[model samples]
Target: SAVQQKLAALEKSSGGRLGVALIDTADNTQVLYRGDERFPMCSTSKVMAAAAVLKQSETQKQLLNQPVEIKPADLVNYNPIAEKHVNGTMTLAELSAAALQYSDNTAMNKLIAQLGGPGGVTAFARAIGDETFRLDRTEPTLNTAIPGDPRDTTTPRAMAQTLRQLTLGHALGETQRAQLVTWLKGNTTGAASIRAGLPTSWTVGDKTGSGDYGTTNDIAVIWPQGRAPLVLVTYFTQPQQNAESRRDVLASAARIIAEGL
Candidate 1:
């Protein structure tokens, strides 16, 4: 259990709690460390939001290409893509791309509305067999990250399991699942986390979240040199306010998890 030991040392030295979950799709080799503990989800909620959009689109069929108008009020912090489109229109597919790839807060809010609200996303997770993932608010509100609060939080194991289902399992249709993977692959925010931790030869697609109180997370689907893809989640959270996102810690954890697998 070198991986667990080293990860514990790192978590202790950093004075924060770290949770990790790893699953190999080939034969289902799995590892869990504090994987059931709740951690603030931050922007990681968008991954589920994006999934809900895809799920709804399956029956509607036209949901993906439907044009969505962007109003000035839709803008929020960290909304690079949404800012540019204010008072304009972008298709649902385009909004999903912005939300997942750019972590655009406004795009996510709009997508949430498309699903009827934060509850819709939560319900989608539940319908898909993930009771551990929840979304109670949108954007800045969701980022509050109140210490020990259960709202808008998820466990590493739960998030990883959801990702495994969406990315490699039959939870999503082929077209929608491929779209999800493509969106995650284009993520711009996870460069210093799981994507950086693994060797360049290994392929990775990930979604990262940073929140108040040092809550930082990354959920990824990774393919090793000669094996099936692995679904991994690394989450770090602390009680302090405005704590910096420990991107390096997550990267190190990802490396150890991949190596041990």
Candidate 2:
């Protein structure tokens, strides 16, 4: 695997603090570099949460645009707008987009509650077919005053599998799948991962995650002309470090790997 060899060289050159996995969807071929370790998924788990919502909607034939009133209590520790707005009105589509595009914690927490509460999203993930991934939705207490469970977790393999399902239209119906990918394409923040290495014109659907510690993760589906689509997951944990540096490292590694592919 030339991709694996390049990745090894990149990691060695970068001091071996990053982990990455790139999968070729056309052939189901995998190129891995330190991909086995499970790191805190950070906000990236919102992707799974969003998928669960779409799955439920498909089965129930519920429109994502159906308006829902968000209450003040639902906004605890989340964004102020999610609480202050008396109407706090939005469609399921808006909520899902906000969670993915902005990594809006409040929006995600509210959507999770709407789906059935924290347990709802977890059950949805398991029922939809993710076994190794676990979303810890422990109640937020004084010690854990965060609005939503910020500790959503997953592994490279699990994230890759989820993306594969999404791309293949296995996770949700065609309409919902299109909507989900649309939201993923609108994600602008995590450019340092898969997008960093590509030509400016390339289109990618991706999400990024950052945590209290050094946790940083990005998962993406890259589309390049004349090349098979690639699913890439890059994650890292550095000791109380600068996130920009981590982002740069992951992005550079991703570009090298994808270019090789």
Candidate 3:
């Protein structure tokens, strides 16, 4: 309860709402602070796309090696890495890494396309027993983050649970799961968020998302020294007209979670 109180104060001071879900995979203990509330997923949803790619790879065998042609038309804003390979081709594995590690918008779109559409992501979530997850649009459009609209959003509880399943649970084959973990560990986008809250001895693999109207998020699998791994999902949203999303808020929340645990 003290963590909730502290988180409430943090939200009040930032003029935003916080949705946090911390899960101890060892015993399945959970801390949910506004955990069921909806928050814009932004690029955090890319993880689902990346997961779907891995899931499909299990059956297709060569799926990860299949090269996907990247046309200029496939490019979108926030695609620094994707734009470079336009007109060339990247293996599905490369695209998955680009989406998860770099939060590449264009890479996300292609993965979504590979799965048939946004609904494919929703289907994958459903198949994994996560009905609370949804992907109603592609990148750029999904980043709009209208104040109350629920499209392309996920609750922190759902995300934390799903991340646990994908990374540490039974959702994927051993090989594919290791592949996903490797990609997530290489992510370059989340230096100041959840990763900033912990000491260097802890291991973390995370994906971050940022969107319009002050939506910032980080979902991670963390291993503290001599402890079982934990899954932490933090989503923050400010409904004010033009509020800025701060990664520092995520760091602050993570610190509270670490201390409270």
Predicted model with the maximum lDDT: 3
Cα lDDT tens digits, model 2, 1-261, are 777677777766765356677788778988766666566676777887788888878867865777768766655443533544446687787778877887767778767777777677778778768775667662222112122333455568777877778765477889888888889999967776668877877779999876644566788888878777888888766544343336766788777875755
Pairs of residues at least 3 apart in sequence or in different chains that clash in candidate 3: none
Candidate 1: which stretches are off by over 4 Å?
A: none
Cα lDDT, model 2, residue 118: 64
Summing lDDT over every window of 10 consecutive residues in candidate 1, give the lowest-scoring window: 252-261
**Per model, how many backbone clashes are there?**
0, 0, 0
Per-model TM values vs. the true structure = 0.98, 0.84, 0.98
Itemize residue pairs with steric clashes in candidate 1: none
The reply for model 2, stretches above 4 Å from the true place, is 12-16, 71-73, 76-86, 138-151, 241-245
Total clashes, candidate 1? 0
- Residue 92 CA displacement from its true place in model 3, Å: 0.4
TM-score of 1: 0.98
lDDT of 3 by residue, 1-261 (tens): 898899889889988888999999778999999998888999999999999989998889999999899998888888888888888999999999999999999999999999999999999999999999999999899988888898999899999999999999879999999999999889899899999998778989999999888888999999888999999999998887477878999999999999966
